[PDB]
């Protein structure tokens, strides 16, 4: 379950959360199984051969990575200063740009407007993502600090922005079938995912199947950091919020 692409450095970076790495001898028996996180850097490719004590993956879990599949110019859409974003500059480092204000922090005018960044070519046309027809458009959540200013070319794997991050009773709970704290959110059915009403008590989400039950929707609180992608299809065996 690997969904990888070749970065600008020539290495292979996996964009699938459910990727498993197996060390299988010539006899066909799997001996070691590891998990490769999203955005990791693979020194070697699938099907190759490595020796013992050799690093094969490297990732950065300190800050969540947000990257663009395509490479090209970035243009800011629905970016109005003082209504949806703020101008904050570091006093010491000097490497900072506009920061995406949260809905509860911005003004009333920018509440109904969703800021986003779109990827275009040298001609200004929206570069269609390979394999799909949708334009290369990506929304930015709250507390997002865009790293590169408008009109600067990027490459695959470039960060768009940075946001901040047993015993007997255990057996008794397992045999009593008690729901844990922070229940992991999973998709009930497969299909595309989209947003709905905002700040109506709690946020809502809509799952539109390809040929299934469209009107299904699920209420999800907006205070919990979700990890869904409305621009990507999600299967029923997918993790929406980790836990």
Swiss-Prot record:
Post-translational modification: Acetylated on several lysine residues in the presence of glucose.
Biotechnological exploitation: Co-administration of salinamide and rifampicin or salinamide and myxopyronin suppresses the emergence of resistance to both antibiotics.
Highest taxon, organism lineage: Bacteria
N6-acetyllysine modification, residue list: 22
Subunit structure: The RNAP catalytic core consists of 2 alpha, 1 beta, 1 beta' and 1 omega subunit. When a sigma factor is associated with the core the holoenzyme is formed, which can initiate transcription. The rRNA transcription and antitermination complex (rrnTAC) consists of RNAP, NusA, NusB, NusE (rpsJ), NusG, SubB, ribosomal protein S4, DNA and precursor rRNA; S4 is more flexible than other subunits.
Family: Belongs to the RNA polymerase beta' chain family.
Function: DNA-dependent RNA polymerase (RNAP) catalyzes the transcription of DNA into RNA using the four ribonucleoside triphosphates as substrates.
Protein name per UniProt: DNA-directed RNA polymerase subunit beta'
Originating species: Escherichia coli (strain K12)
């Amino acid at each position: 379950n690997v969904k990888s692409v070749v970065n600008s450095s020539g290495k292979l970076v996996i964009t699938s959360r459910n990727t498993e790495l197996k060390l299988i001898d010539e006899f066909g028996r799997t001996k070691e199984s590891y998990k490769v996180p999203y955005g990791a850097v693979l020194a070697k490719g699938d099907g190759e051969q490595v020796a013992g004590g050799e690093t094969v993956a490297n990732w950065d879990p300190h800050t969540m990575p947000v990257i663009t599949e395509v490479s090209g110019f970035v243009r800011f859409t629905d970016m109005i200063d003082g209504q949806t974003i703020t101008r904050q500059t570091d006093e010491l480092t000097g490497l900072s740009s506009l920061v995406v204000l949260d809905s509860a922090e911005r003004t009333a005018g920018g509440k109904d407007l969703r800021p986003a960044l779109k990827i275009v070519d040298a001609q200004g046309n929206d570069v269609l993502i390979p394999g799909t027809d949708m334009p290369a458009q990506y929304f930015l959540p709250g507390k997002a600090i865009v790293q590169l200013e408008d009109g600067v070319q990027i490459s695959s794997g470039d960060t768009l922005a940075r946001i901040p991050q047993g015993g007997l009773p255990r057996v008794a709970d397992l045999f009593e079938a008690r729901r844990p704290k922070e229940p992991a959110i999973l998709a009930e059915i497969s299909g595309i995912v989209s947003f709905g009403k905002e700040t109506k008590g709690k946020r809502r989400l809509v799952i539109t199947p390809v040929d299934g039950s469209d009107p299904y929707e699920e209420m999800i609180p907006k205070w919990r950091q979700l990890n869904v992608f409305e621009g990507e299809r999600v299967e029923r065996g997918d993790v929406i919020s980790d836990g």
